[PDB]
Design an enzyme around this catalytic site. Sequence first.
Site, short mmCIF file in Angstrom:
data_model
loop_
_atom_site.label_atom_id
_atom_site.label_comp_id
_atom_site.label_asym_id
_atom_site.label_seq_id
_atom_site.Cartn_x
_atom_site.Cartn_y
_atom_site.Cartn_z
N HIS A 192 0.81 -1.22 0.00
CA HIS A 192 0.00 0.00 0.00
C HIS A 192 0.86 1.30 0.00
O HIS A 192 0.29 2.39 -0.11
CB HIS A 192 -1.09 0.03 1.10
CG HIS A 192 -0.59 0.17 2.51
ND1 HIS A 192 -0.11 1.38 3.00
CD2 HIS A 192 -0.62 -0.72 3.53
CE1 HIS A 192 0.19 1.16 4.27
NE2 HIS A 192 -0.11 -0.09 4.64
N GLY A 228 2.48 6.10 10.51
CA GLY A 228 3.88 5.92 10.13
C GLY A 228 4.50 4.63 10.64
O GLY A 228 5.67 4.35 10.34
N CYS A 256 3.44 1.55 9.80
CA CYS A 256 3.30 0.51 8.77
C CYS A 256 4.66 0.00 8.32
O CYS A 256 5.57 0.79 8.11
CB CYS A 256 2.47 1.03 7.59
SG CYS A 256 0.72 1.30 7.98
C1 LIG Z 1 -3.71 7.86 10.33
O1 LIG Z 1 -4.06 7.25 11.57
C2 LIG Z 1 -3.45 6.07 11.90
C3 LIG Z 1 -3.02 5.13 11.01
C4 LIG Z 1 -2.49 3.90 11.45
C5 LIG Z 1 -2.05 2.87 10.57
N1 LIG Z 1 -2.25 3.06 9.18
C6 LIG Z 1 -3.32 2.69 8.43
O2 LIG Z 1 -4.32 2.12 8.88
C7 LIG Z 1 -3.19 3.03 6.96
C8 LIG Z 1 -4.09 2.19 6.08
C9 LIG Z 1 -5.39 2.60 5.79
C10 LIG Z 1 -6.27 1.76 5.11
C11 LIG Z 1 -5.85 0.50 4.70
C12 LIG Z 1 -4.56 0.11 4.97
CL1 LIG Z 1 -4.02 -1.47 4.47
C13 LIG Z 1 -3.67 0.94 5.63
C14 LIG Z 1 -1.50 1.72 11.13
N2 LIG Z 1 -1.39 1.49 12.45
C15 LIG Z 1 -1.82 2.44 13.27
C16 LIG Z 1 -2.38 3.67 12.85
C17 LIG Z 1 -2.83 4.66 13.75
C18 LIG Z 1 -3.34 5.81 13.26
F1 LIG Z 1 -3.78 6.77 14.11
#
Ligand SMILES: COc1cc2c(NC(=O)Cc3cccc(Cl)c3)cncc2cc1F
EC number: 3.4.19.12
Lengths: 299, 305
Positions: B41, B143, B145
Amino acid sequence: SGFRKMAFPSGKVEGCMVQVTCGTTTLNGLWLDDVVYCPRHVICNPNYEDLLIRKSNHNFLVQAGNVQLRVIGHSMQNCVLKLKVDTANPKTPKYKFVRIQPGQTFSVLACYNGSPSGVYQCAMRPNFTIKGSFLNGSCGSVGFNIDYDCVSFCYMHHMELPTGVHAGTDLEGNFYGPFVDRQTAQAAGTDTTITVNVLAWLYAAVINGDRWFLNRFTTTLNDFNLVAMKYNYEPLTQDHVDILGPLSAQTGIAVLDMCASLKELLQNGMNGRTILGSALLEDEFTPFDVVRQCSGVTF
Amino acid sequence: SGFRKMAFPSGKVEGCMVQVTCGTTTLNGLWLDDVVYCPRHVICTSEDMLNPNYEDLLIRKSNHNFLVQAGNVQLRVIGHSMQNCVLKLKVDTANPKTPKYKFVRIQPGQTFSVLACYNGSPSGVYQCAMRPNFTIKGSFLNGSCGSVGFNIDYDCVSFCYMHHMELPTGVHAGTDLEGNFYGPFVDRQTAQAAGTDTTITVNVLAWLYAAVINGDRWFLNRFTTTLNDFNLVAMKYNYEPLTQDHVDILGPLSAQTGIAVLDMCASLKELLQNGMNGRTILGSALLEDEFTPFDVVRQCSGVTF
Ligand SMILES: COc1cc2c(NC(=O)Cc3cccc(Cl)c3)cncc2cc1F
Ligand SMILES: [Cl-]
């Protein structure tokens, strides 16, 4: 989201762990530059200067991985033995020796035979003991914090007390607590809860969406301390209130408003509920640990 | 003595963390030999996340579109391929800090250490378990990921998880190092939710054996149970079914402490019925399910108190 007991990455410390053998005793040492630091009880009513003078450099076997280090000198500083070696550690990080206060947290890299086996987070209890996880051979394992790229060494493991808790020194050999390095009748004092840390942990729960314990009430510092003394909680000072300032501004809950929440939790309990997956009030996260985990500071 | 939630030393993993940038997106990558592994992604926009066609997005990229940073050094991308939900970036330098490693796919109930990273820089290490609903209860911000889950067996690092996303309840979803997701999740912004979670029964039993080894026996009783009767009771408290495999796995702990597996199942039944009554077990007022039988044998002594 999420709130875990998080330790500092241990890599800079792993590259300093060595095995120290003297006679039958084998424990861990910290190799920084050309000196290996380890508990002085490795040479063991012990008159330590009298036992050390009998020893020669070649009596101390130092092992760094599969390589033997040559001991060229030895001296004692309080309860720490300092072994001068021929080779400087190429993996020596930027470091400081610091003495921490009770209530402050740190990471422990538990080692056996100079080999690291685990890393965990813990706090210096108000009674100066640590609730660690240690077996025989863990002596010499160290406690640390990382500030930017500098490792601050604060603890060296020396012994286990009869209740299963642990006692040790700073890296200059001074014990935390009224303990001595010898087999004698020693017991940890009555422990107390670290109040400023429970408050920080309540602020972390608010940040993560747990607001069931909030109420409309506030309190005075004096009234809160009269109540906290009844539950074996450490007194809360104006310094603690100032330290919680950032968390108070971020969540909109003043320290004395959150104190009134803590007061209600002490007198009524949780009533079948949990806070951050815990049925107990957690006191091993400082206000700085909460801010760091809820901001993502890297090393 | 003592029982802590202990993570593996993270040094062997820290030396593999890199920063991967593609357009506006910046996340973490795992640099092993001459390949950097990261979530696919990274090639997406936030719009693209609703229904991304990754093959169509990837065909439009060239090697120089992927910026890889290892410390203060830039790595040159010389190739790229996709394997399931992981992007594999071929680089021109092999990681000199590459440890002995394996890629392993774990089952629910298994535990592992997570090295949480931001901008290719490690910030913390914690221990966690793969929940029965295939999610992990991690501590992750934006960030994170690309952060990885691992176990260190002897001197070999077994990589079992790569972080991909956060679900609406605050729990996390990700893949093995071959890009296959754990759970019925997709790397898409579609309405997905974690299934109802359950307690890992074999892990709570292991943790009760660790308490007995450390000298605590207050919770034991004179009763036994059949496996069937234990499972009928456990299901009512949202506990995972206990299988004959779990019973066999608890064998060593049973022989060390002298308490039969089905006798320990009888104490658990009573704990579920009565609660703790103001008492704790290993400093906990809840029944702990994130220590496997293998974790207990590793951390605890070989002699019962
Ligand atoms: C922007 O807010 C956050 C993002 C996080 C995050 N990233 C996603 O979920 C990005 C994403 C979206 C949709 C499908 C996918 Cl596969 C990935 C991973 N872990 C913790 C997070 C905590 C957060 F507060
Ligand atoms: Cl597994």
